[PDB]
Amino acid sequence: KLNPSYISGFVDGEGSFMLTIIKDNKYKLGWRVVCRFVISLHKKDLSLLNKIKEFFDVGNVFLMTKDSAQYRVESLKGLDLIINHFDKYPLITKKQADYKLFKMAHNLIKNKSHLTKEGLLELVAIKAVINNGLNNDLSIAFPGINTILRPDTSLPQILNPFWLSGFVDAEGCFSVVVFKSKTSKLGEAVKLSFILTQSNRDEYLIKSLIEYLGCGNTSLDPRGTIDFKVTNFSSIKDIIVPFFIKYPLKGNKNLDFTDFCEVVRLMENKSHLTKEGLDQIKKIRNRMNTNR
DNA sequence: CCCGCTCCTCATAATCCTTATCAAGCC
DNA sequence: GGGCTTGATAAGGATTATGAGGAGCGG
Ligand SMILES: [Ca+2]
Ligand SMILES: [Ca+2]
């Protein structure tokens, strides 16, 4: 039935709130303004996409040409049910600001303000701060907009474990890596890892995970991204594994968590020190994540 | 015609996810 | 003593996140 806090947590990772302003001769002012909300996932998560549709009970799930599909919402009534939800189950990443702007533009469209010259100017000023902002065409066409400020989003606190389970279902990773350790009996070793990746803008949120889960550490990526990594076994077995079983994943990634947990059990018996348990771990690794 | 809403498909690239190698150390 | 663990430390590449717009509908 999909938990609402799981929804906000998943949309916080995957999903986009957009305000499209494209030149269209069909409109009196020669400009088409439309609000849209789209989650774009790999086809393997087609089932999850349809579950999200059932959650909102609006929009449709479209099967793209590639190994990907989208849950899309592009109607007034539809967006109204989406805003009804996020006004009660808000996002907590920087995407929240993109949502509040998407909400401002939506209200103006409900007033037909996109059909007037002044209203269209307000909508262009808003789009100028949503996601990637204006392009080189809108800058040329709409010079002199009253530049509005991108809404500020207070520092985030994780307040519901189901939110984190959706945020993890969207941007988490369960790694079972076997590397070569010359100082070991078998010459190899097993490195388990839990990973939550995000951009520098939400570094506060990522460090929040350290206190919420009570473990892990923050890692900075030179390219401009921050990771939350739990890399010690004792915490993975006692904290992470129990957490994502009590607050389980719903997408395709849950399968990887299942195989991930199976490796945890073989490592709790010290089986990973033998060749039989190590071989079984490799058989498990070879069938999870990028090997399905 | 002109005007307005929205289904449905196609497009792009980087923020993600994923897979790595390593040695100081604990236990 | 010395296996075995674990944060530090890279980097790959595709699933994403963001997006454009034709054409079918009614007035
Ligand atoms: Ca994201
Ligand atoms: Ca994902």
- Listed as ranges, the nucleotides of chain C within 7 A of a protein C-beta are 2-11, 13-23
Residues spanned by CATH 3.10.28.10 within chain A? Answer: 1-139
Q: Which residue has the tokens 């997408």?
A: A251
Nearest DNA or RNA nucleotide to A172 (CA to C1'): B17
Q: In angstroms, rounded to a whole number, what is the distance separating the alpha carbons of residues A281 and A268?
A: 13
Tell me the nt nearest to A215, Cα to C1': C7
Order of all β-strands in the sheet with A60-63: A16-23, A31-42, A68-73, A60-63
Approach to solving: X-ray
CA A215 to chain centre: 22
Buried b / exposed e over A11-22, threshold 16 CB at 10 Å, is bbbbbbbbbebe
- What are the residues whose beta carbons fall under 8 Å from the beta carbon of A44, sequence distance 6 or more? A67, A252, A292
Measured CA A182 to C1' C7 distance, in angstroms:
19
CATH of domain A1-139: 3.10.28.10
Please list the residues that pair with A178 across neighbouring strands: A190
Q: Quote the CA–CA distance of A274 and A21 in Å, as a whole number.
A: 61
**Rounded CA–C1' distance between A180 and C12, in angstroms:** 20
- Please compute, for residue A98, the number of CA atoms within 13 A of its CA located in the half-sphere on the CB side: 20
Length of chain A as a residue count:
292
Judged by C1' against the alpha carbon of A189, the nearest nucleotide is C4
* Nearest Cα to Cα of residue A194 among A213, A178, A180, A179: A213
A222 CB-near residues (< 8 Å, 6+ apart):
none
C-beta of residue A164 within 8 angstroms of C-beta of residue A212: yes
Find and give the residue nearest to C8, measured CA to C1'.
A219
- Most distant pair of Cα atoms in chain A: their distance: 77
Instruction: Give bridge partners of residue A63 from the DSSP assignment.
Output: A69
User: Using the CB atom, is residue A219 less than 7 Å from strand C?
Assistant: yes
List, as own/partner pairs, every contact residues A102-109 make where C-beta atoms lie below 8 angstroms and the sequence separation is at least 24, other chains included: A102/A17, A102/A18, A102/A19, A102/A35, A102/A37, A102/A130, A105/A19, A105/A33, A105/A35, A105/A130, A106/A35, A106/A79, A109/A33, A109/A34, A109/A35, A109/A76
CA of A13 to the centre of ligand 2 (A): 7
Q: Cα–Cα distance between A238 and A259 in angstroms, integer?
A: 17
Is A168 buried (19+), middle (13-18) or exposed (0-12) by CB count in 10 A? buried
Neighbours of ion ligand 1 (CB under 5 A): A 13
Please give the Cα distance from A101 to A86 (Å, whole number). 13
* Cβ neighbours, 10 Å, residue A134: 18
Q: Are A40 and A67 in contact (CB under 8 A)?
A: no
What is the C-alpha separation between A173 and A81, in angstroms, rounded?
A: 31
Run of H or E residues at A18: strand A16-23
Helix (H, G, I), strand (E, B) or coil at A19: strand
- Name the pairing type of β-strands A188-199 and A225-230: antiparallel
Q: Which residue is nearest to nucleotide B9 (CA to C1')?
A: A64
**In sequence order, what DSSP letters do the residues of A176-229 get, joined into one string?**
EEEEE-TTSSSSEEEEEEEEEEEEGGGHHHHHHHHHHHT--EEEEETTTEEEEE
Q: Which residue is nearest to nucleotide B4 (CA to C1')?
A: A27
Ligand nearest to the CA of A131: 1
